[PDB]
Design a protein around this ligand. Structure first.
Ligand code: CLA
Ligand code: CLA
Ligand code: CLA
Ligand code: CLA
Ligand code: CLA
Ligand code: CLA
Ligand code: CLA
Ligand code: LHG
Ligand code: LHG
Ligand code: ZEX
Ligand code: BCR
Lengths: 729, 80, 69, 40, 31, 142, 40, 75, 75
């Protein structure tokens, strides 16, 4: 059999495992038959080109469908009432009830409602007509074409890069820091100054007349003379109406701080000075590493110099380890991307940038949940690929005595202390929750154990929150830090000291309990991942686990039984804990923000201290509108969300077949089915080509986890969207 | 097919040979142990990787190891 | 160099008793790769799933042990 | 009896005895002094 | 004002090009 | 002036309204009144329920610090007597057998000699018997 | 089904191709490829 | 024989707890107005709320095993 | 179970006339209905010396004690 050409062991398999494992190991280039380092790197480079092209095509499609079947040019005229439209609906299986229900947003056909918040983003960056959206879509199509051709070309034999070109860390860091980060952010600041701000002040600027009109009445003279303060003079007033000239300033780079009075978002001039300053900082940073002119630092010398007297070898030889290993780099990148994705969610739900996006609550909830789930996935992937590195790329003789090889020296202490902290969190957190539940159940809720989150309230006070009366730092109007005349202080203190926004929401005892529960979840998921990564090389039960690879089923029932012993099994276990922690996080966020938006903060303040309140006031209470999407009496626009809710509740359960039942039973059943097919007249004419077999053990775990995760995501997505849209949208 | 390897820690206890259900192992003369015999795996093309041989081995960790590889009709134990 | 009645520490690095202490049961004439026999109080993992015990003895070479006594 | 004393000293009997002793301590202290949220 | 059908057809014609380039890139990566 | 959003339950209208109906946990008919008079001295939220302060201040020491030491003494007692019994039973030619069949005389002897556990632990740490060297402990392959 | 967007006839043909024609064709070609013997 | 002894102990327990800690005589007068009840909870930590009102001035856990109807059917 | 899934989808799409319901495509358990009809007629002739049906679940009058229904026909 030809498929799979990249592996001969799988190509000679007569069963159906050949197809499954060919699909599974397709994009794992490091273990293909006869794979060289150079070819591996070049294939990776081309594939990365492909993913970039796919991303650009996806963005172009979003833009195109919004421009074609949306209501952008009517949404701009009333962002506070009109619902954004994602794409039209063409379902031949629809009935008349669904057609009448989904003809929403003042359309003339069945249509969806966008909850990705792209309308706010497009409005904020100055796109006011759908022709501009169409032009952007076509330009993105062209960009994707260019990137696909670039991948094809740099795959050609004479344009094929060398191995040393792929291992030039200094030049790559310099170019990507100064150019990819600094220059791109500088160009973005230029876009905001030259186009976005004038469009916010009711001036139409496009390609046809941007080269003529200067962004400021004094163009480029103060910048070179040194009179920069001119650009910050006469900012937009608090009576500014977005998109018009009513009460608008002429300043382009300001440090106004706080939020726009109307849009409840950050000032665009603040965005401009922010991205410009960031661009300057990145351009300075990009000139750090020497490439070929003598000037600059070399990473190897830096790492070998920073040796420690307590760590034996310090960061010795880490340059070679990181440069030779691709899994190390992928783990570092995934960890960083996950951390900054969680940061993006946290700092965007509280500091909205796009106009009128705070009012649209469903989109805010969706964005927070989406980017937080993505951050969790990336964080799991970082540890998974780090464990893969330990299995494959780690050298115990090149890294002798450095910090990396010293983790394995005190790995037992790491795992033991981490397990202790997880147990300590879990025991007492569950104890407090159950204590509150029982106490409230007996009709005496005044005996609840309610701890005030003192430290976080103190942090809020330090940032300038005067509600709690700590009067420390920015809350103290006499401290040095609050008397520096910083330009952002008045507006920032005005924004933080109003409960109308999510900026530093008021906290209470239930917030304390749920933050400590989230800490439990984080420490436990980290425990699973770290134990799997550190035990990847081997353990007492399997001292030679490295010789078995990364993903193997077990070692049989011998030595007491060794089910789920590979590091892949540690990843498979930690995925569940990631999902559970994300569930706790998003439930907390959603309930608190539902209370905030409705104004009934008292509900969360009271009933979040015991689990029955979570079960009743959040799960039972908010589900009423969702499950009534379709009724024996009729159907409304939430019908699709109810169907998807049940769809998730079904796929989640379906995953339990693979998670609970194991292989031998299904293999025996398949043997009986094979016998039945072979003995059936008129059915022996048709015979299989690959002998049917049951799914392998690792494949079974993966498939069950996939069904589980898809159901888990879909159920909560449907519930969140339906509840928030019915209640508010 | 799976690969069965016997390391130099075998004590010639013959447990692995008897535990093997598909007749892959064998006892051959040797000198490194008191029993003056060691285990060999001449018929690894018939091994299904059931790990009974390893379960029978009494030495510390395992003197006999089984690594699972390419799956054929024999090594998958198919009757159809 | 050892004999019966010696407490030794293991250095096999793959054994179950790496870092443990065991008693020297017996040794014999040369020609054998691992002559020394060491018996341990804590049994290892050996046995089928759900078994009630393991194995308390093993064979080690001379240079895999350190003498304590 | 020797066997009777040995059986009484086995792990489950002893842990049950200690658990019931501690449960009695807590039950009595909570009957006589209920609703102790803290030491004032 | 809304888009014109000629714009949609032109968009499809333009999108034809990245399809061909993607097919070429995939065939090159198959080798 | 900490906790400007918190007021004592004695001056909280919500607590004053809701404390007249406190239930009786035991058969004692005054336990509701005792609960009310004891909880009047705490800091209450807008919901009229007491809140605890654990920032370390001694004015609210009864909230966490006193029960903290109360728990710590008992937990140390239990751990120390368990460890001492295990250590003394190890060299009995059947420590595994005596782990399922408890040696009641020795168990009680260790139970009694366990109130001085902090001093004993401090002395043992200075004597080096509390911890073992990393070269004397079984370790798994790296 | 019909809509008021420009070129309303495009879904009428595009959706069936991406729903029936394209999946049928790609699964047929994939089944043919994954079963071609030899040239492993 | 042992399991028979255990079952007999359980049955005697049910009969005793219906004899002493139940309102069977009370329920027997107005069975359409008194809920069956044969479990009474000590008030210790507020579980005395479980001794709910089953009618006729008796406070205890309402039972659903149908023992009262069986006993009345037995005379 | 695909009957249930099909009904769910038909209701979701605003197609109640395509469902498997009593006001739609019907799946009448006519065999159990027939056996109920037979068991209701048993006191008449098939068991002449019986006064009433073995149970009112099969059919007949509605037996109610106090204000609550004790047993009524189960269609
Ligand atoms: C019998 C049930 C049924 C069916 C067949 C459909 C069918 C459809 N609905 Mg639909 N719908 C249903 C019930 C159903 N609906 C119900 C009960 C509701 C609730 C009222 C809705 C609500 C609804 C809405 C709100 C919308 C639709 C839309 C659509 C269309 C989307 C086209 C599409 O997805 O193509 C693309 C196909 C896919 C994305 C399927 C991919 C799935 C797999 C898992 C991914 C591929 C994995 C793997 C890599 C594949 C390998 C390659 C492969 C080729 C072999 C399609 C015609 C949409 C529409 O009109 O489109 C414009 C739309 O907006 N439906
Ligand atoms: C100035 C010159 C320059 C530039 C612009 C680039 C640019 C790039 N190189 Mg690169 N490279 C260079 C010189 C340069 N290189 C040199 C000299 C070498 C040899 C030493 C290399 C060797 C090299 C390799 C080996 C690879 C690249 C790759 C890449 C691409 C990474 C893909 C990506 O995520 O980008 C997009 C990234 C950004 C736009 C910025 C990251 C975003 C951060 C996290 C901040 C987030 C922004 C903001 C907060 C969010 C915006 C929100 C908004 C959407 C609303 C990128 C296009 C990779 C590739 O495959 O590309 C084809 C790759 O594998 N480069
Ligand atoms: C980084 C991207 C970027 C780009 C491509 C542009 C491009 C432009 N700007 Mg602009 N600008 C930017 C960022 C950017 N700007 C930022 C971040 C600010 C800060 C607020 C400004 C502030 C600004 C003002 C105030 C004016 C322009 C003007 C112009 C136009 C001609 C003058 C010029 O740039 O020559 C640069 C010429 C030089 C001699 C610079 C030195 C050589 C460089 C380093 C190369 C041109 C379309 C002028 C305009 O609209 O034309 C009438 C004008 O009056 N810009
Ligand atoms: C930048 C991203 C990135 C990159 C480039 C890689 C690269 C790689 N990973 Mg890695 N990984 C990542 C992120 C990444 N990973 C993350 C975030 C995680 C955490 C989940 C992992 C977890 C992980 C594991 C656990 C393993 C790898 C492995 C690998 C290697 C290739 C084998 C493979 O996964 O292909 C094959 C991939 C698949 C078969 C995935 C198919 C599953 C699909 C996408 C799910 C679709 C679900 C369903 C259809 C949705 C339909 C919805 C509809 C019904 C509504 C390769 C080095 C493997 C390895 O060890 O290589 C040596 C391996 O075992 N990775
Ligand atoms: C609600 C379900 C649930 C619960 C309570 C736990 C609890 C625990 N898991 Mg866990 N787990 C679960 C589901 C659950 N898991 C699932 C579905 C998976 C996916 C396979 C995992 C995968 C998993 C892994 C991979 C790991 C854990 C670990 C842990 C422990 C970490 C300590 C902790 O978080 O709290 C502290 C513990 C608790 C709150 C549980 C104790 C609860 C009782 C009430 C305490 C009192 C005992 C009780 C009185 C006994 C009465 C018995 C008698 C009536 C017969 C803990 C024992 C980690 C571990 O071992 O940590 C060291 C670990 O490595 N779990
Ligand atoms: C203040 C005086 C006082 C009074 C009037 C009672 C009265 C009672 N206790 Mg009691 N008790 C007390 C102090 C008191 N206790 C103290 C200080 C302790 C802690 C050692 C206990 C521990 C205790 C237990 C553990 C139990 C009782 C039980 C009982 C009841 C059964 C009769 C009895 O004591 O024999 C039984 C006495 C014991 C089994 C242990 C007594 C240990 C002594 C006090 C030392 C009875 C209502 C029993 C009960 O209610 O049955 C469920 C029961 O199980 N008590
Ligand atoms: C960041 C966490 C943190 C930590 C670890 C502490 C720790 C402590 N605080 Mg504290 N505190 C914090 C945040 C924190 N505080 C914040 C945010 C505030 C402002 C709301 C306060 C306000 C505060 C006050 C007002 C007081 C403390 C005191 C104390 C000490 C109590 C003495 C004790 O129990 O040890 C002894 C333990 C044993 C003998 C056993 C202790 C060292 C008290 C003090 O002065 O002690 C030094 C005190 O009066 N704290
Ligand atoms: C926010 C989370 C708070 C808890 C996180 C983790 C709790 C425990 C963390 C302790 C680190 C382990 C003990 C330090 C490990 C250790 O002692 O390393 C020795 C190291 C001394 O470093 P040297 O100056 O020898 O060299 C350090 C570098 O030059 C090379 O590593 O001490 C520290 O750096 C302590 C700070 C680590 C942070
Ligand atoms: C709502 C009902 C909830 C119960 C659902 C039933 C779950 C199915 C039952 C399990 C299979 C039954 C036979 C077990 C299967 C079997 O026999 O053993 C299987 C398993 C050991 O199996 P291995 O194959 O490892 O054993 C081989 C060894 O036996 C070598 O001889 O033993 C146990 O599961 C240990 C459980 C002991 C339990 C320890 C706690 C004792 C508590 C006793 C209190 C009991 C309740 C008291 C009365 C209330
Ligand atoms: C002695 C003993 C043992 C052994 C014990 C050992 C070996 C212990 C070893 C401990 C080590 C190695 C390290 C310990 C570190 C402890 C730290 C870091 C304590 C930190 C304390 C803090 C941060 C206090 C914080 C605040 C303090 C204050 C009360 C505030 O209001 C509240 C709050 C929470 C803010 C056992 C386990 C064997 C048996 C036991 O019974 C006894
Ligand atoms: C095993 C392994 C691995 C994995 C692991 C991981 C992935 C990890 C992660 C980790 C993580 C992920 C971490 C994180 C961290 C973080 C941090 C460390 C932070 C810090 C911060 C800070 C410090 C801050 C500060 C501040 C504040 C607070 C305020 C003000 C401002 C400032 C900034 C000052 C790797 C692959 C690597 C390699 C190989 C091996």
């Amino acid at each position: 059999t030809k498929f799979p050409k990249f592996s001969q062991d799988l190509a000679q398999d007569p069963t159906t495992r050949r197809i499954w494992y060919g699909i599974a190991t397709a994009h794992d280039f490091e273990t293909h038959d006869g794979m060289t380092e150079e070819n591996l790197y070049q294939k990776i480079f081309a594939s990365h080109f492909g993913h970039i092209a796919i991303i650009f095509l996806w963005t172009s499609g979003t833009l195109f469908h919004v421009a074609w079947q949306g209501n952008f040019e009517q949404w701009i005229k009333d962002p506070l009432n009109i619902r954004p439209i994602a794409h039209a609906i063409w379902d031949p299986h629809f009935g008349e009830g669904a057609v009448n229900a989904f003809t929403q947003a003042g359309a003339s056909n069945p249509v969806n409602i966008a909850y990705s918040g792209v309308y706010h983003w497009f409005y904020t960056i100055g796109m006011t007509t759908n022709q501009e959206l169409y032009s952007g879509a076509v330009f993105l199509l062209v960009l994707a074409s260019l990137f696909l051709f670039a991948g094809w070309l740099h795959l050609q034999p004479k344009f094929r890069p060398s191995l040393a070109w792929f291992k030039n860390a200094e030049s790559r860091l310099n170019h990507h820091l100064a150019g990819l980060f600094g220059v791109s952010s500088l160009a973005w600041a230029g876009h905001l100054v030259h186009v976005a701000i004038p469009e916010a002040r009711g001036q139409h600027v496009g390609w046809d007349n941007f080269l003529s009109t200067p962004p400021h009445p004094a163009g480029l003279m103060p910048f070179f003379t040194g009179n920069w303060g001119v650009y910050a003079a006469d900012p937009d007033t608090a009576g500014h109406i977005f998109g018009t000239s009513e009460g608008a300033g002429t300043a382009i780079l300001t440090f106004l701080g706080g939020f726009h009075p109307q849009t409840e978002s950050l000032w665009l001039t603040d965005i401009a000075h922010h991205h410009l300053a960031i661009a300057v900082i990145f351009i300075i940073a990009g000139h750090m590493y020497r490439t070929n002119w003598g000037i600059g630092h070399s990473i190897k010398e830096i790492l070998n110099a920073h040796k420690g007297p307590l760590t034996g070898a310090g960061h010795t030889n880490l340059y070679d380890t990181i440069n030779n290993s691709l899994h190390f780099q992928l783990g570092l990148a995934l960890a960083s991307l996950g951390v900054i994705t969680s940061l993006v969610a946290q700092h965007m739900y509280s500091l909205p940038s796009y106009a009128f996006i705070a009012q649209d609550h469903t989109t805010q909830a969706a964005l927070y949940t989406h980017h937080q789930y993505i951050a969790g996935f990336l964080m799991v992937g970082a540890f998974a690929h780090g464990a893969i590195f330990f299995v494959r790329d780690y050298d115990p003789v090149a890294n002798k005595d450095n910090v990396l090889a010293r983790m394995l020296e005190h790995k037992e202490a790491l795992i033991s202390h981490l397990s202790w902290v997880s147990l300590f969190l879990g025991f007492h957190t569950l104890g407090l929750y159950v204590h509150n539940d029982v106490v409230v159940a007996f009709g005496t809720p005044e005996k609840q154990i309610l701890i005030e989150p003192v430290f976080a309230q103190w942090i809020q006070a330090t940032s300038g929150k005067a509600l709690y009366g700590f009067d420390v730092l920015l809350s103290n109007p006499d401290s040095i830090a609050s008397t520096t005349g910083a330009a952002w202080l008045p507006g920032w203190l005005d924004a933080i000291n109003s409960g109308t926004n999510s900026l530093f929401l008021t906290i209470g005892p239930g917030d304390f309990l749920v933050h400590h529960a989230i800490a439990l979840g984080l420490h436990t998921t980290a425990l699973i991942l770290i134990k799997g990564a550190l035990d990847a090389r081997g353990s007492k039960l399997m001292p030679d686990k490295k010789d078995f690879g990364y993903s193997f089923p077990c070692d049989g029932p011998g030595r007491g039984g060794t089910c789920d012993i590979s590091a892949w099994d540690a990843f498979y276990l930690a995925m569940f804990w990631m999902l559970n922690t994300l569930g706790w996080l998003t439930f907390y966020w959603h309930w608190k923000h539902l209370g905030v938006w409705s104004g009934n903060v008292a509900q969360f303040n009271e009933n979040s201290t015991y689990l029955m309140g979570w079960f009743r006031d959040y799960l039972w209470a908010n589900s009423a509108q969702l499950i009534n999407g379709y009724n024996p009496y009729g159907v409304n626009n939430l019908s699709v969300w109810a169907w998807m809710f049940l769809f998730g509740h079904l796929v989640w359960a379906t995953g339990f077949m693979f998670l609970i039942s194991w292989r031998g039973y299904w293999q025996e059943l398949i043997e009986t089915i094979v016998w039945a097919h072979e003995r059936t007249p008129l059915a022996n004419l048709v015979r299989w080509k690959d002998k049917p077999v049951a799914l392998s053990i690792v494949q079974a775990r993966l498939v069950g986890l996939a069904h589980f995760t898809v159901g888990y995501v879909l159920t909560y997505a449907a519930f969140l969207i339906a509840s928030t849209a019915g209640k508010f949208g | 097919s799976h690969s069965v390897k016997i390391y130099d820690t075998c004590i010639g206890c013959t447990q692995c040979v008897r535990a093997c259900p598909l007749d892959v192992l064998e006892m051959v003369p040797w000198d490194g142990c008191k029993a003056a015999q060691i285990a060999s795996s001449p018929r690894t093309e018939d091994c299904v990787g059931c790990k009974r041989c390893e379960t029978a081995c009494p030495t510390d960790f395992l003197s006999i190891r089984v690594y699972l590889g390419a799956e054929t009709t024999r090594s998958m134990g198919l009757a159809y | 160099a050892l004999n019966r009645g010696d407490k030794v520490r293991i250095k096999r690095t793959e054994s179950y008793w790496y870092g443990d202490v065991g008693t020297v049961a017996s040794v014999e004439k040369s020609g054998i790769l691992y002559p020394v026999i060491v018996r341990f109080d804590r049994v290892n993992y050996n046995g089928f799933s759900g078994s009630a015990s393991g194995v308390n003895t093993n064979n080690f070479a001379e240079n895999e042990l350190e003498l304590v006594q | 009896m020797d066997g009777l004393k040995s059986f009484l000293s086995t792990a489950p009997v002893m842990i049950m005895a200690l658990l019931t002793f501690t449960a009695g301590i807590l039950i009595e202290f909570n009957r006589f002094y209920p609703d102790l949220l803290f030491h004032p | 004002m809304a888009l014109s059908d000629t714009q949609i057809l032109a968009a499809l014609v333009v999108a034809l090009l990245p399809a061909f380039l993607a097919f070429r890139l995939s065939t090159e990566l198959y080798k | 002036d900490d906790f400007a959003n918190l007021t004592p339950c004695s001056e909280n209208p919500a607590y004053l309204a809701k404390s007249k109906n406190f239930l009786n946990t035991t058969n004692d008919p005054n336990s509701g009144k005792i609960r009310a008079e004891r909880y009047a001295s705490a800091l209450c939220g807008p919901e009229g329920y007491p809140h605890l302060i654990v920032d370390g201040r001694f004015t609210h020491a009864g909230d966490f610090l006193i029960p903290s030491i109360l728990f710590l003494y008992i937990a140390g007692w239990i751990g120390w007597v368990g460890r001492s019994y295990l250590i003394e039973i190890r060299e009995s030619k059947n420590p595994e057998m005596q782990e399922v069949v408890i040696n009641v005389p020795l168990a009680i002897k260790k139970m009694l000699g366990g109130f001085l556990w902090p001093l004993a632990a401090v002395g043992e740490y200075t004597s080096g018997k509390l911890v073992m060297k990393d070269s004397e402990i079984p370790t798994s392959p790296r | 089904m019909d809509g008021s967007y420009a070129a309303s006839y495009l879904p009428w043909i595009l959706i069936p191709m991406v729903g029936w024609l394209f999946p049928a064709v790609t699964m047929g070609l994939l089944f043919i490829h994954i079963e071609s013997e030899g040239e492993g | 024989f042992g399991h028979l002894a255990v079952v007999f102990v359980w049955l005697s327990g049910m009969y005793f707890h219906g004899a002493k800690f139940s309102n069977y005589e009370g329920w027997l007068a107005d069975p359409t107005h008194i809920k069956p009840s044969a479990q009474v909870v000590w008030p210790i930590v507020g579980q005395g709320i479980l001794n709910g009102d089953v009618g006729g001035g008796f406070h205890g856990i309402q039972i659903t095993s149908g023992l009262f109807y069986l006993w009345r059917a037995s005379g | 179970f695909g009957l249930y899934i099909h009904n769910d989808t038909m209701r979701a799409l605003g197609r109640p006339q395509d469902m498997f319901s009593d006001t739609a495509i019907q799946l009448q358990p006519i065999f159990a209905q027939w056996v109920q009809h037979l068991h209701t007629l048993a006191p008449g002739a098939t068991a002449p010396n019986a006064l009433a049906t073995a149970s009112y679940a099969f059919g007949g009058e509605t037996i109610a004690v106090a204000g609550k229904v004790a047993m009524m026909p189960i269609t």
